[PDB]
Amino acid sequence: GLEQLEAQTNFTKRELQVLYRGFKNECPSGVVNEETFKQIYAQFFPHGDASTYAHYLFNAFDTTQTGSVKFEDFVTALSILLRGTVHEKLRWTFNLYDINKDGYINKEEMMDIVKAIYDMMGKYTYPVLKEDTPRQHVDVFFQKMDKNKDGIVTLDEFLESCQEDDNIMRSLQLFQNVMVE
């Protein structure tokens, strides 16, 4: 299904082969489980514990929710993360934070993800994420993004906030980018 795969992503046929080669190179069995994913991701952050964030990142890749990320799942997410539009990329990130796939983000979900990011960055969570604690960042995040103040952040509130603030966007995307470097 390389032809079906090429039609659905931003990659050519020969780029897909270069991607497959690298995929098997790192995943001999042809599929990636959580641990393998956590191992690979861990390296992007040696000064912290990125396993919990890598956990959320894994599920977002595992769209079929099979606990096993196939090559197409991998390319499908890369197609977006690597060469998707800001709109497409932000939607991917919103979906990552929307853990229960409510269609919305609550403070509890925000906390989980953000607590994962702080642990990942360790004590070197530079201005990327100011504020001493995750709880303090989450409250400042929601205040700015939850425009109608109903304690919920919808996709639209999320996009508008990001569109009107280069800072909010980075604190969200930064971690998705490290992978498409």
CB of 98 to Ca ion, least distance (A): 4
Residue with tokens 């929710």: 65
User: By C-alpha distance, which of 100, 107, 87 is closest to 155?
Assistant: 87
How does DSSP classify residue 129?
G
Among 35, 150, 160, 164, binds Ca ion (CB under 5 A): 150
Asked if residue 143 binds Ca ion (CB under 5 A), the reply is: no
153: part of which helix (H) or strand (E)? strand 153-154
Q: Which stretch binds Ca ion (CB under 5 A): 9-17, 33-41, 100-108, 163-171?
A: 100-108
Among 17, 64, 100, 177, binds Ca ion (CB under 5 A): 100
Residue with tokens 């800001």: 86
Chain centroid, CA 20 distance in Å: 21
Binding-residue total with Ca ion (CB under 5 A): 8
Query: Based on CB atoms, which residue is closest to Ca ion, 130 or 147?
Result: 147
Residue type, 84: G
Asked if residue 164 binds Ca ion (CB under 5 A), the reply is: no
119 annotated as a binding-site residue: no
Separation in Å, CA 87 to CA 11, 92, 96, 130, 152: 18, 9, 14, 25, 20
Q: Which stretch binds Ca ion (CB under 5 A): 59-67, 86-94, 146-154, 162-170?
A: 146-154
Cα gap 140→130, rounded to integer Å:
10
CB within 8 Å of 6: residues ≥ 6 apart: 12, 13, 16
Query: Based on CB atoms, which residue is closest to Ca ion, 73 or 146?
Result: 146
Contact map string, positions 103 to 122, toward Ca ion, x by CB under 5 A: -x------------------
Known binding residues for Ca(2+) are 98, 100, 102, 104, 109, 146, 148, 150, 157
Known binding residues are 98, 100, 102, 104, 109, 146, 148, 150, 157
